[PDB]
Design a protein around this ligand. Structure first.
Ligand SMILES: C[C@H](CCCC(C)(C)O)[C@H]1CC[C@H]2[C@@H]3CC=C4C[C@@H](O)CC[C@]4(C)[C@H]3CC[C@]12C
Length: 436
């Protein structure tokens, strides 16, 4: 049907009625074919680096050239600050990819494919037009199905820029049918020997009643550097804190302590992350400059090998039949193909249980950060980067919502684990089957 027919359709009405009985698992809802996306969540990891030049920029800034690598402030105080400004610009640049890509390619936000345990998605940004850049690799793996958890790493060996992280969510519907989403997990970016800890923001899905879903961000995100510098990004939409949707205000401080006083902000950035934003240095409001305009720089999609040469665990290869059925809009075929894949997985889980076998993750391992870890689990190292960055930001190391600070209600929750997924580069180095 035409999108103008979605909202009043029998299918959508049935879907909305099933929300009143939501059990916490989004996959239990009856999503009509018109609201389905043929893209799996394991693919979302690619949204962290669709602007290759911004991802790598920090690695080109040093003590001898930093003032030439800060467009909005050729008088920037230090290379550490120039790099924080670059990391902040990169982070803001990821937002349109992360949260607006389906609206552009599908017409609205839609239900992504729920990845199967073990699902992989790999590719690379060859950066052919920039030999100094080198190849940037993406590795994404579904490390959990119950609940869904995606782990990923994006790395550029040539310039020593590496990123790793994981993601999972908890969702709930309000009585007004707003889908509230809390993200869990964090991402770490290493620029040579300098590190940055990034926490994703909470969000909500609007437009459910009218069958035209879209994401709006809320809350805050943090970017804590090993240099002590901290960027605090606050999100809002429509009105109340801004005159337009997809808005934000970011402030960079010398350290976490200073972030307690907005007046101590070294720079203040404001605007729309899906559009343009300006930056002000100190309190010189009369001298604002353009910081980033998402509309001027088209996203660069990574190179993925043809389906013909993909391993059975690779996302597009595995979901091929379902994706085809979704594109055809065939109700019965979508049900048939999806059930075939998911039933096969259920059978595997039951077999492993009967034989006393467990599923082994491929390139990531869960590290128990709790004081009393499981006797067989892996434990963090001495100079763990996450621990030092979390300490500097006074961030909870428990499995609380992303960005939870020590002492917050979520951090004071009883019997809360502290297990975090970490990339094991050695496992990729010794990979014997998967290629790019
Ligand atoms: C599961 C729901 C859709 C449910 C639709 C329904 C209720 C009709 O089935 C989707 C919609 C928006 C999706 C998020 C979009 C962006 C991101 C950022 C990425 O880095 C991690 C995944 C995440 C949080 C998506 C999760 C799934 C979401 C909420």
């Amino acid at each position: 049907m035409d999108p103008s027919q979605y909202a009043s359709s029998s299918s959508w009405t049935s879907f909305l009625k099933s929300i009143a009985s939501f059990n916490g698992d989004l996959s239990s809802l009856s999503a009509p074919p018109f609201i389905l996306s043929p893209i799996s969540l394991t693919e979302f990891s690619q949204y962290w680096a669709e602007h290759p030049e911004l991802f790598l920029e920090p690695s080109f800034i040093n003590d001898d050239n930093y003032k030439e690598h800060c467009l909005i402030d050729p008088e920037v105080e230090s290379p550490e600050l120039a790099r924080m400004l670059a990391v902040t610009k990169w982070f803001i640049s990821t937002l349109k990819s992360q949260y607006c890509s389906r609206n552009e390619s599908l017409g609205s936000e839609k239900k992504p494919l729920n990845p199967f345990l073990g699902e992989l998605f790999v590719g690379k940004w060859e950066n052919k037009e920039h030999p100094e850049f080198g190849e940037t690799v993406l590795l994404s793996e579904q490390v959990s199905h119950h609940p869904p958890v995606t782990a990923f790493s994006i790395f550029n060996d040539k310039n020593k820029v590496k990123l790793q992280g994981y993601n999972q969510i908890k969702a709930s519907f309000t009585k007004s049918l707003m889908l509230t989403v809390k993200q869990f997990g964090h991402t770490m970016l290493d620029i040579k020997d300098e590190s940055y800890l990034v926490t994703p923001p909470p969000l909500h899905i609007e437009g459910i009643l009218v069958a035209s879903p879209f994401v709006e961000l809320e809350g805050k995100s943090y970017i804590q550097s090993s240099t002590g510098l901290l960027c605090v990004i606050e999100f809002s939409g429509r009105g109340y804190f801004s005159g337009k949707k997809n808005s934000f205000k970011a402030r960079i401080y010398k350290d976490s302590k200073d972030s307690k006083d907005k007046e101590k902000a070294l720079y203040t950035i404001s605007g729309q992350w899906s559009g343009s934003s300006k930056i002000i240095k100190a309190n010189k409001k009369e001298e604002s400059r353009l910081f980033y305009d998402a509309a001027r720089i088209p996203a660069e999609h990574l190179n993925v090998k043809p389906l013909e040469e993909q391993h059975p665990l690779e996302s597009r290869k595995a979901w091929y039949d379902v994706a085809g059925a979704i594109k055809l809009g065939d109700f019965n075929l979508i049900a048939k193909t999806k059930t075939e894949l998911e039933e096969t997985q259920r059978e595997l889980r039951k077999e492993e249980e009967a034989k006393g076998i467990s599923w082994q993750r491929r390139w990531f391992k869960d590290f128990d950060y709790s004081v009393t870890p499981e006797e067989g689990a892996l434990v963090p190292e001495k100079d763990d980067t996450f621990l030092k960055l979390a300490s500097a930001l006074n961030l909870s190391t428990k499995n609380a919502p992303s960005g939870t600070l020590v002492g917050d209600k979520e951090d004071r929750k009883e019997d809360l684990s502290s297990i975090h997924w970490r990339f094991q580069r050695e496992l990729w180095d010794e990979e014997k089957e998967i290629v790019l």
